[PDB]
Amino acid sequence: AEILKSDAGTVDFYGQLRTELKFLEDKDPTIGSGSSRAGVDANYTVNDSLALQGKVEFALKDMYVRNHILGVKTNFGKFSFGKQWTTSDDVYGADYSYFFGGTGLRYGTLSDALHDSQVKYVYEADSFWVKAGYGFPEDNAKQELAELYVGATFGDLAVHAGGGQNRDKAFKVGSNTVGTTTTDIKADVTNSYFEVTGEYTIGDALIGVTYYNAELDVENNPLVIDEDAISVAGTYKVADKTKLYAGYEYVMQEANTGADEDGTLVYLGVEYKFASWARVYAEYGYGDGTTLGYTNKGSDAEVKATKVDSANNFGIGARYYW
Numbered sequence: 001a002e003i004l005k006s007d008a009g010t011v012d013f014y015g016q017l018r019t020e021l022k023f024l025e026d027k028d029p030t031i032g033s034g035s036s037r038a039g040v041d042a043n044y045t046v047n048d049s050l051a052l053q054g055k056v057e058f059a060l061k062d063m064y065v066r067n068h069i070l071g072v073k074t075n076f077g078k079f080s081f082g083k084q085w086t087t088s089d090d091v092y093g094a095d096y097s098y099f100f101g102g103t104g105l106r107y108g109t110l111s112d113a114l115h116d117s118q119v120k121y122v123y124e125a126d127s128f129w130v131k132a133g134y135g136f137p138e139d140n141a142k143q144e145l146a147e148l149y150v151g152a153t154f155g156d157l158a159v160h161a162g163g164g165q166n167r168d169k170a171f172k173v174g175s176n177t178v179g180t181t182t183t184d185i186k187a188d189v190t191n192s193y194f195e196v197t198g199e200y201t202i203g204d205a206l207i208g209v210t211y212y213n214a215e216l217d218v219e220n221n222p223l224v225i226d227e228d229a230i231s232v233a234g235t236y237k238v239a240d241k242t243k244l245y246a247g248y249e250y251v252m253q254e255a256n257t258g259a260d261e262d263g264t265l266v267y268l269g270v271e272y273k274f275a276s277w278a279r280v281y282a283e284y285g286y287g288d289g290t291t292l293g294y295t296n297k298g299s300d301a302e303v304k305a306t307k308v309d310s311a312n313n314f315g316i317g318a319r320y321y322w
């Protein structure tokens, strides 16, 4: 990106402007959900064995801090402190969409993929890696979080596995009205999760599969909910500038009361790159059934718990990068 400074030190000014139109079943078109941002990333190498990083990223709305990081890289790994995305969000899984996928990735149900005071660790060797994180609860003002993932690449097959636990002692589930007493439903909820992923590259094709489990339990309550999830997705480079993509996502939710639900999400889309600094995309999404909540990494959208009936959805977008 825009190198302001460069030597043993570099200062990089970077960002994205986005314009996105969303057409959701039974709604008027929405313009302006596009997640634009701008930041600065400063790096300095002290020697062969030690480097420092300072990064800050703001949303372009009014303006507010998205990430704010101090980093220390050493021969025994990299340690990063401050307001960061979760390690679970960085590793992600087999969702290749720009708008509607991610329903089978179950790490974000409570956290929305962010904790304002974390320490994150990364170790890399050859093709092999370890990534971990911990969130400081601040005498209960912030959630509890602890995560660990490992992965490697063996020829054309890349694999990873891991997970964690995320606790929110006062999570807002929703609201109830009984006569004229309207009241918030809040609970002490823990989300415990684990996943395995494989991604296979063959020529112009990429195919991925992710399995996820999660367990939601409530501290002073017999209620437990288990989720079992599969995501099957791929991409295909049909020309130098042009990539097609598609996925199928199925999730079953089972409560210890015996209540069962499930949800299906299918997407198909196309990406076109004008240049390294410009691209556009268009996507169709078909949803049926239930989600307890998910995050689409591509667009940064959060979808709260919901049920839909045979819903047809479309998105179109364009981005500028520097």
Ligand SMILES: CCCCCCCCOCCOCCOCCOCCO
Pocket: 159, 161, 196, 197, 198, 209, 210, 211
């Ligand atoms: C006991 C925990 C061990 C988990 C580590 C990885 C297990 C092997 O992973 C291979 C990656 O598989 C991705 C998931 O689905 C593969 C099943 O489908 C095979 C046909 O595509």
Ligand SMILES: CCCCCCCCOCCOCCOCCOCCO
Pocket: 209, 230, 232, 248, 250
């Ligand atoms: C490892 C590659 C898997 C191939 C895709 C199938 C995944 C389907 O999940 C099994 C659980 O299904 C229960 C409901 O299935 C409804 C009809 O499914 C259409 C098959 O894609």
